[PDB]
Amino acid sequence: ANNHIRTVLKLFRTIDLDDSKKSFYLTAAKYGIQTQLREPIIRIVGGYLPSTKLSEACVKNMISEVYEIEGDFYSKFSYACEDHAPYSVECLEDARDDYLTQLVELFKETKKCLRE
Ligand SMILES: [Br-]
Ligand SMILES: [Br-]
C-alpha cells in the first residue's frame, strides 16, 4: 500500500552516488537503479495490504549492495577501464551490461525477503 511505497521511496532517496561524477555516467547509473530496482519493488510493495509487514532489513541490504554494484560500474567506467580511455562512452557502454545484470540479480534476491 502507500505506506510501504513511502518507506521504500525514502530509502531509495538515501542513495548517494557522488553527484560530482560525470553527468552522463550518473544518468546511466541512476536510470539502471530506477528501472531494475526502484520501479519493480514499488510495484510489488504497492500491492501489499496496508497491514502487511515489509522487511526494512531486506530493503536496507538491497541499498547496501547498490553501492557495491555502482562502485564496480564506476571503477570500470573510469580508472579500471581496460580497452578505452577512462570516462569514454565505450568504457561506460562496455561496463553497463554487467552493471544491469548485477542489478537484475539483486532484484531477484531482494524479492525473496521483502515480506517479513
Ligand atoms: Br517508482
Ligand atoms: Br499482502
Residue numbers in the entry: 1 to 116
What's written in the study?
To combat these defenses, Anopheles mosquitoes produce inhibitors belonging to the SG7 protein family that block complement at the alternative C3 convertase, C3bBb. In this study, we describe the structures of albicin and its orthologs SG7.AF (from An. freeborni) and anophensin (from An. stephensi), characterize the binding and mechanism of AP inhibition by these inhibitors, and determine a role for properdin in modulating the inhibitory activity of SG7.AF. SG7 family members are quite similar to one another structurally, but amino acid sequence divergence suggests that specific side chain interactions are key determinants for the observed differences in target affinity.
Previously, we isolated albicin, a member of the salivary SG7 protein family from females of the malaria mosquito An. albimanus, which inhibits activation of the AP in human serum as measured by lysis of rabbit erythrocytes, blocks the cleavage of C3 and factor B in serum, and binds specifically to the C3bBb complex. The structure of albicin consists of a bundle of four α helices stabilized by two disulfide bonds. Helix α1 extends from the N-terminus to Thr 14 and is followed by a section of random coil that extends to Lys 22. The loop connecting helices α3 and α4 extends from Ser 78 to Ser 88, with α4 extending from Val 89 to the C-terminus. These interactions may be important for the positioning of the helical elements and stabilization of the helical bundle. The SCIN family structure consists of a bundle of three antiparallel α helices with a long dimension of ∼41 Å and an orthogonal short dimension of ∼14 Å, while the four-helix bundle of albicin has dimensions of 50 and 21 Å. We assessed the oligomeric state of the albicin-inhibited complex observed in SPR experiments using gel filtration chromatography after coincubation of C3b, factor B, and factor D in the presence and absence of albicin and nickel ion, which is known to enhance the binding of C3b with factor B. Albicin markedly reduced the retention volume for complex elution, indicating an increased molecular mass for the inhibited complex beyond that attributable to addition of the inhibitor alone.
